[PDB]
Amino acid sequence: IQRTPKIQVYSRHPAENGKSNFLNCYVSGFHPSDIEVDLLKNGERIEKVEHSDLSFSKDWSFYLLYYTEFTPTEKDEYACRVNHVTLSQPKIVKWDRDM
């Protein structure tokens, strides 16, 4: 069975520019477990990104939360890039602060 990952990019606390916050990329609903997720700030990949221990839900598919501490500004765009065997190309979903 191979299931495509579902992805959400969001802030731990509602974002206000200039205040440190956290950027989560929750990837869920996938199988197999090998998936590459990395948070990109302005296209550049961020290092110093942490992530949870791999677990699965009821239908046996996996999910993982990747995160980094960040401080929004107006100028900086953030995104989460994900690449998995079901994906013909990696998926870059950008952070929107209203979602």
Partner: protein, 270 residues
Amino acid sequence: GSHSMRYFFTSVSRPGRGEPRFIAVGYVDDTQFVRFDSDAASQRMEPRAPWIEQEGPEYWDGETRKVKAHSQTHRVDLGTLRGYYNQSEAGSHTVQRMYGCDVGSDWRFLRGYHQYAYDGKDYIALKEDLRSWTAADMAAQTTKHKWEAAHVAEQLRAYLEGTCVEWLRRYLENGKETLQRTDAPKTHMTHHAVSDHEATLRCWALSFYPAEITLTWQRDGEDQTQDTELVETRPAGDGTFQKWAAVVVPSGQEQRYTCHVQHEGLPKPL
């Protein structure tokens, strides 16, 4: 209140070189408290919640010993399973095991479960009744023949009705401060104009625990489903969860629409 404990086990073979990767995660309700990862230097069952750090080294040496037992039975399992489905030697396969028990409001045993999957799908799972096994396949049928003969299901009934409940009850007492503390959602709504003639109302429920939340919108007192986008409940990363549900509205009519938030830590909110 109904509480529970579950262990999620994942095993992935690394065909090219080495052992299969093994991750074991433990949770009490929506809280993770232990982990074991094979590609970790400790090579130990490590704590992941304040309240289980109280446990003495007799516990950490005994949990490590066991989680390791397990890694090794799934290493064997991945070999067996490839004979049974007759597969090639140089692809990965995942086995996944899940077990645990729920207790109810009286803190007594309620449900118990021990399931198992291979490569994404159900393989063999014990029944609700804790006396028979549901084999999904004719390979899983081999394993059910073995487990029936061996009285595997009885060995597990004792753990799921005994050890499991026993230790879930203490995890709850040592963890009272958080484990028995529901954080009701902190709600608020936003309004975003899609166009000159339509707006999106987003009803946000943030910082809540457990993760079970019901977010439903209503127009003129009847529930609304049409033109409602909604998200999967996501982890905030601090132990709580967030979720929102939106609805597109005619601009000027947003008085009609109300969001109704349902959650254990709440006497119902509109």
